[PDB]
Amino acid sequence: MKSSAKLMYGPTVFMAAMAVIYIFATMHVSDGGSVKGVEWVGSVALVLSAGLTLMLGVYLHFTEVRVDVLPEDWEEAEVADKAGTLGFFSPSSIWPAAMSGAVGFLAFGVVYFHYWMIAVGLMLLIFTITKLNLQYGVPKEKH
Amino acid sequence: LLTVSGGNDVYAMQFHVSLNAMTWIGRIGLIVGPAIAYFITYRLCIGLQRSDRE
Amino acid sequence: MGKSFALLVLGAIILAGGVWYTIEVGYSVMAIVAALIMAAGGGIITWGLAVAADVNSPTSHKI
Amino acid sequence: EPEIYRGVSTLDEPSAAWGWHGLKRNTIQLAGWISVLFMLGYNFGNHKGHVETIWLLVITALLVIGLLIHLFEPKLSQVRTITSRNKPVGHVEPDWTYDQATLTGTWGNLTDSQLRSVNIEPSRVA
Amino acid sequence: AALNRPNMVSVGTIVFLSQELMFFAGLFAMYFVSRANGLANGSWGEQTDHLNVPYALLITVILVSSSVTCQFGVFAAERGDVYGLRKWFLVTIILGSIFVIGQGYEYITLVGHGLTIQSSVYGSAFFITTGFHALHVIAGVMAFVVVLMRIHKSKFTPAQATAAMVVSYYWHFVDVVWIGLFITIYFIQ
Amino acid sequence: FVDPAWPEHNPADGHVVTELISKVAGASSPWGDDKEFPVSAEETGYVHPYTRIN
Amino acid sequence: MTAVAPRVDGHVAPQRPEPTGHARKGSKAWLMMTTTDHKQLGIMYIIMSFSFFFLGGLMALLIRAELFTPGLQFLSNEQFNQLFTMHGTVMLLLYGTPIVWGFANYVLPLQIGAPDVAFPRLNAFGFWITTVGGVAMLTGFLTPGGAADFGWTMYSPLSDAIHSPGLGSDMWIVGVGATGIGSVASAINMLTTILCLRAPGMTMFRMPIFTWNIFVVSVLALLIFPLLLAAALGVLYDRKLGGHLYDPANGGSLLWQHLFWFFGHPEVYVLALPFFGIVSEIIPVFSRKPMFGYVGLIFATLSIGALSMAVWAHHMFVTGAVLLPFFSFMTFLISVPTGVKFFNWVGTMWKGHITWETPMIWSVGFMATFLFGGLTGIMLASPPLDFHLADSYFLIAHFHYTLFGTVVFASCAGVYFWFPKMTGRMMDERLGKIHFWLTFVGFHGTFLIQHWVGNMGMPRRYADYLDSDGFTIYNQISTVFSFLLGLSVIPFIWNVFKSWRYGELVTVDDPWGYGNSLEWATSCPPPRHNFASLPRIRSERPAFELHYPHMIERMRAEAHTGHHDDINAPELG
């Protein structure tokens, strides 16, 4: 991610430059095919659109400073250099499906605008998110 | 399905469904609902058996 | 080449049937049915052409 | 070795030995055809509309199609063709990565030029 | 050495927080457009007389305080202190649950003297922006509680430490959004 | 205070987990990253239950 | 240097896992409910997408049948209006966006040398939320009133509590919101696997064009989907409660239009870049030439990343509310990187050895289509030309050459290409060619003359027209060829079904012969963890050098235009 943190500056500076052009060009140019005055949707959502790229770019930049030369980031690396452990990946879980079902229940709750359905769907969602996180933590059954 | 059909007039209004459609869902659903339930349940039982052997 | 020409002729006759059938049924519901007829005809013609253009430059051999 | 208990193989249903497993194929069709009879018999009410009959006939057709391909059990066969740069059945695949790591087999005969192009000098191999 | 390398979960959470910021881009856009044509006919001024600016500062400092305590909790997780994490997370939960009550009370005291959703464009824009933030704060508090009950069952390895650090990321994002949202509503008017 | 389950690491020129860096490429193992697997069937304390039906 | 390992005696081969023909009862039922494998997830993610394709395309036929002749033959105004709303929605959000992540879930971990995705349980949630959103959105048809009937853009104040009442319009909003969570849940872990989980020696610039495209799309989908969720929840807040945010008397119409099109065109380009990548995978393999201008492609894709954000109000030239010069010019720029990456394809095919299998046929039948689609895109980008063409029927023809271009031709190309990888079996070539020719003739027929009618004064969302308009023959031709287009899926479905269980067995880890991507260095299908062994990655084409060692010196010596004089340079320390 040495180069990943860098390539975000491209879009960041581009969108920052376009946002400032947009604000100044929309509030001071009368075209005849529109009216004069700053547009408050293309300005806020394009200033803050550059914000996303800047955030991710800066975070990855700070992160990449304090990382050693990884084999994946090394041009002439042997396959045997990463020989070790790649951390912990969940093999299986039923909870993603359940919590999709829970968001579906809340969705229809909001559609029909039934208070009980919204309330149940909200707490049916908290439960499933909780169970997703506590999946590998459920203690050995104490008698 | 019998239980839902028993209160299908409160289902129809509160969930914005045709009452005639509800009657027909009950009529047809009593044949194809059980069939699909059997198929899925059987397959899932065997699936649970398989995961248990792995 | 064998299957091809047969498909072309069958498609052509079906398409001609459809084109002829549209003219009677002016702007009725049956115009849709005649559209389906000509679509099937055209489909068969293109199927024939595709099989013709496959036996010319084949990419799969019979074992 | 797999064991058969009551016409049901432990290979297809692992715990064939523990519980009721498999309905005979003749009972799956009795239910199906009885259902088809009921679905056709629904057309004899008092309903004036014809939307519901369209659904009845469509579902009956889907049931009939299902009950026929369950009865005659249609099967096909292996295609048995050859596509561009694909090998026939009974070909042994060399371990490419093993041949790449140690200069054997596929990578068994490289020109001295070809050794240096992959960053290894020929003096290192004997 | 062990050849240290980026925290995968932390990078995942930062990429999630970026998208959550564009969620509020929509809300801010709606607020600013309604503000623009509210100033045009001199109607905006009348509506912002319903704001309790002093009261909105006390809850702000409460939320900032919650953030600082949260960071303290995370400082305790790097070192494997279960109890340091446990204590500061509880104080953050308490501090963050009085914000919601405080914010909720503002709503109750605001609908009492004129400002509702179905009363003005200002009312609708005020409640959309502040409402969604309140939902996010509730979600953050629930995240804290689930982390607290996660480290009650598991053995507190670096896995639990990582979970705590990312929840802190979420909390920091929420309070930063509040900081940006309070200036917009209560200061800029 | 340091948790018993915390990996035994030198607190000098090395940190196991911080805000943004770690020692693995992926999620840390919830059963201790320093735990060597697999182990003997005895340590698991799983008792294979002999059962006979009828 | 290279560190040649000692020849170990006894090493025979990996297991070489079995193809998909032989599956036992219960082997898939409960596995799919709880799976966190990106392979099976991707398979079911593509299948579901195509199911929605067939379902959403049936609506297009009903629309197209009604337009055969003047007068309302079987369909009403209300039913016609809600039939293009749901057609344009199911095809863009229930087929388009998912099919993007299906090719992402399957091959992206396989292309960078990863064992799995970063968050296996999260993309498993991304699949289940999208399907739920889809089912929720389509529940509108099961209400007496019907589904949503406003288009796929939900303009204001046509889409408020006053106008367009009924629960279908809420279902649409909520379903769109839910399907948009699946896109962001998938973009999170398509972006963090690229960063974190990569094979030894696979630098960022060793990754294929496909992964670069999904990289850019991921960062581009993170900033558009939340915005749509915010806008749609603003409308729901207006409808369900008594909010006044979208009243015409304070923007409202224009506010929504800006808010929508800001994600309207970024979602459009989330449907194009991955399929450009797919095509960029297929062309080099069937031409026995490397991807011409690799870094050129990188820069082109990166340009479209940033430029696509500054062009959103070119969708609203006739509103008379936007700055015409700003958006007109910005749009003209976004054609330049596309032109670049389009010349790169020609460069790749240039003086190559082309074998015409199904993937290459599809890919070439793509460029010819999308080219004309993009050509009539710069037409609409000029306001003097867009005044006549906006909200008209020439527009309809334009975004069917680009949508049906990318998301259909390139998607099908990807299916034929990766089928041996995904299943260990190969698709029938004759049936593939039949499918292509049907879907090609049947498409150009139904959409070419569509241009002509739009210019002579037929606007888009019209249920009916008069005989005294001249739009009769054209509608007739379009309907005939559309019914032909609908039949093309018959060979496709038969091919996929038959070849899944009976297709020719793949006995080599690279059936297409000259594959140059990390997926072609593994068994078909891969063994549950993507890799039974990992090669040395030294370029962007690690599988090619793996299979063809005798030419490693040739592909370096003549890769550049000339003045290449490093082969005679002294060694470093």
Ligand code: HAS
């Ligand atoms: C990738 C995205 C898209 C594809 C693909 C697509 C395909 C077609 N379209 Fe389209 N489209 C139109 C014509 C066609 C035709 C003839 C096809 C063809 O590709 C047709 C494809 C048809 C099929 C592929 C059907 C095969 C299915 C068969 C033969 C039977 C299925 C049987 C069963 C049992 C179903 C299976 C069920 C299961 C549950 C498994 C027309 C005009 O006739 C309009 C404007 C309407 C108006 O007046 O404004 C239009 C409007 C749109 C819009 C704008 C929506 C709006 O204005 O609100 C979008 C975004 C869009 C995208 C797409 N469109 N199209």
Ligand SMILES: CCCCCCCCCCCCCCCC(=O)O[C@H](COC(=O)CCCCCCC[C@@H](C)CCCCCCCCC)COP(=O)(O)O[C@H]1[C@H](O)[C@H](O)[C@@H](O)[C@@H](O)[C@@H]1O
């Ligand atoms: C937990 C999962 C549960 C999922 C269940 C979802 C399945 C529900 C399908 C619902 C379809 C409803 C379509 C509506 C259709 C409708 O409204 O038509 C009515 C008549 O309803 C019908 O016959 C349709 C009944 C047939 C439906 C069959 C349902 C069987 C289900 C259970 C099995 C399939 C799904 C399985 C999914 C399970 C998942 C596992 C795989 C008559 O119209 P009418 O009220 O007279 O009004 C009009 C005047 O107003 C107007 O003048 C006009 O002129 C008149 O003509 C008249 O139409």
Ligand SMILES: CCCCCCCCCCCCCC(=O)O[C@H](COC(=O)CCCCCCCCCCC)COP(=O)(O)O
């Ligand atoms: C098991 C089979 C049950 C048989 C039911 C037959 C099917 C017809 C159902 C009709 C549903 C009507 C729904 C409706 O109109 O909603 C409401 C009317 O009925 C109800 O309030 C439903 C109450 C159901 C219990 C939910 C309690 C939630 C608290 C959980 C705490 C643990 C109207 O919406 P509202 O109340 O205003 O929010």
Ligand SMILES: CCCCCCCCCCCCCC(=O)O[C@H](COC(=O)CCCCCCCCCCC)COP(=O)(O)O
């Ligand atoms: C709380 C619920 C618990 C009770 C569960 C109910 C079980 C009682 C039912 C017993 C079923 C016997 C099954 C059996 O043994 O299989 C078979 C019995 O024969 C049948 O299949 C009967 C066919 C009847 C079909 C009915 C059609 C329904 C039409 C719809 C009507 C509207 C025999 O099994 P076998 O031959 O061994 O494979």
Ligand SMILES: CCCCCCCCCCCCCC(=O)O[C@H](COC(=O)CCCCCCCCCCC)COP(=O)(O)O
């Ligand atoms: C649709 C989701 C939008 C969520 C925006 C959150 C808005 C916060 C409401 C604050 C109350 C404003 C005061 C007021 O006017 O009160 C009342 C009106 O507002 C309400 O009833 C509050 C609605 C409750 C929000 C529902 C939560 C949605 C769950 C999320 C699941 C997606 C006053 O009623 P009155 O005019 O006196 O009759």
Ligand SMILES: [Ca+2]
């Ligand atoms: Ca007509």
Ligand SMILES: [Cu+2]
């Ligand atoms: Cu555009």
